[PDB]
Amino acid sequence: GFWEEFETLQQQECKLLYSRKEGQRQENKNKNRYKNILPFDHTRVVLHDGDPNEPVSDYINANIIMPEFGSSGKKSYIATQGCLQNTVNDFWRMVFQENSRVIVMTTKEVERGKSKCVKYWPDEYALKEYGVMRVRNVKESAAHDYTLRELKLSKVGQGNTERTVWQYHFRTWPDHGVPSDPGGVLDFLEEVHHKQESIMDAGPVVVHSSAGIGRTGTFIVIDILIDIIREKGVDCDIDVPKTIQMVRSQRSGMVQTEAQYRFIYMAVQHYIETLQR
Amino acid sequence: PGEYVN
């Protein structure tokens, strides 16, 4: 039962209470959108190469999520919150350092009067410097449910560091609850998957939401489960609770609501039914 | 910073 399964998961959280001390440091307080939502220390993305005048330059509210313990970076994700005004530069340091080539944005910049992500990309055709990083917005391609932005990211002053980063911005997720059917998300995730698959040396896919746990966990868990079906077929074992437990061992609270939990099952079933057609 | 309870 969906209701019983999600409740059992919500109770099991007491054994994934790993340290979150770095995000609790005074220097990092203003780098978190939400005081209570912090990365586990052992899976957090540690930022190197920071300004040597900054006493703490190694922190972003983000964790690596591996679907399996041996996963390559190309098969992994970074779950993170939407940028704050003061973390846009750190976000691009993270994207560059981790060799990420695909970003999945699951919110608008603002929903119901609240900032869910400060704009971290230039206007179409424009060039912006974000700290030491330079970003050109080469082209935007607008679909029904999402916009794709082809971004070119490089380190200022250093040639031959340029790489293309593809930002898939899902724009129609409802302000409350979840989409009433998963077709839009499934089509979006299919494009994300093929783009990531096509890039030889790609690092983890960056996925973000206001806190980096609810919509972020929903998209990541759907993506993991559909990839199992890609490899193993429509009759394979699918274990939604165990997959949620795996991602929750790497960032607290992934998948926040019962509607999200039901949406994951619905997305997987629709993926299966399109294949069977 | 605030509190995410969704």
Numbering used by the authors:
A (entry chain A): 5 to 281
B (entry chain B): 893 to 898
Task: Reproduce the article's own wording on this structure.
Two of them represent substrates modulated by a phosphorylated +4 position: the 15 aa long pY632-pS636 peptide from human IRS1 (ppIRS1) and the 16 aa long pY191-pT195 peptide from human CD28 (ppCD28); The third peptide, the 13aa long pS892-pY896 (ppSRev-IRS1, shortened Rev-IRS1 peptide) from human IRS1 represents a reverse orientation, modulated by a −4 phosphorylation site. To prove that a negative charge at the −4 position in a substrate also increases the catalytic activity of SHP2, we selected the Y896 site of IRS1, where a conserved Ser phosphorylation site flanks this GRB2-binding pTyr from the N-terminal side (HPPEPKSPGEYVNIEFGS motif). The rate of dephosphorylation is greatly enhanced by the −4 phoshoserine, similarly to what we had seen with the +4 modifications earlier using the IRS1 Y632-S636 site containing peptide. Conversely, the −4 Ser phosphorylated peptide bound one magnitude stronger to the inactive SHP2 catalytic domain despite both SRev-IRS1 peptides already containing a negatively charged Glu at the +4 position. Our solved crystal structures clearly present SHP2 with an open WPD loop, despite the catalytic site being occupied by a phosphotyrosine peptide. Likewise, the other two structures show an asparagine from the substrate at the same position (+2), stacking against the similarly dislocated pTyr residue. In the case of the ppsRev-IRS1 carrying a −4 pSer residue, a somewhat more complex picture emerged: Here, the phosphoserine was either coordinated by Lys274 and Lys280 (“Hill” region), or Arg278 and Lys364 (as well as Lys−5) in an alternative conformation. What is more, the +4 position carrying a glutamate residue was loosely associated with the same loop region that coordinated the +4 pSer/pThr residues of the two previous complexes. In case of the ppSRev-IRS1 (−4 phosphorylated), the pSer coordination dynamically alternated between the “Hill” site (Lys270, Lys274) and the “Loop” site (Lys364, Arg278), with an intra-chain Lys-5 also contacting this residue in the majority of runs.
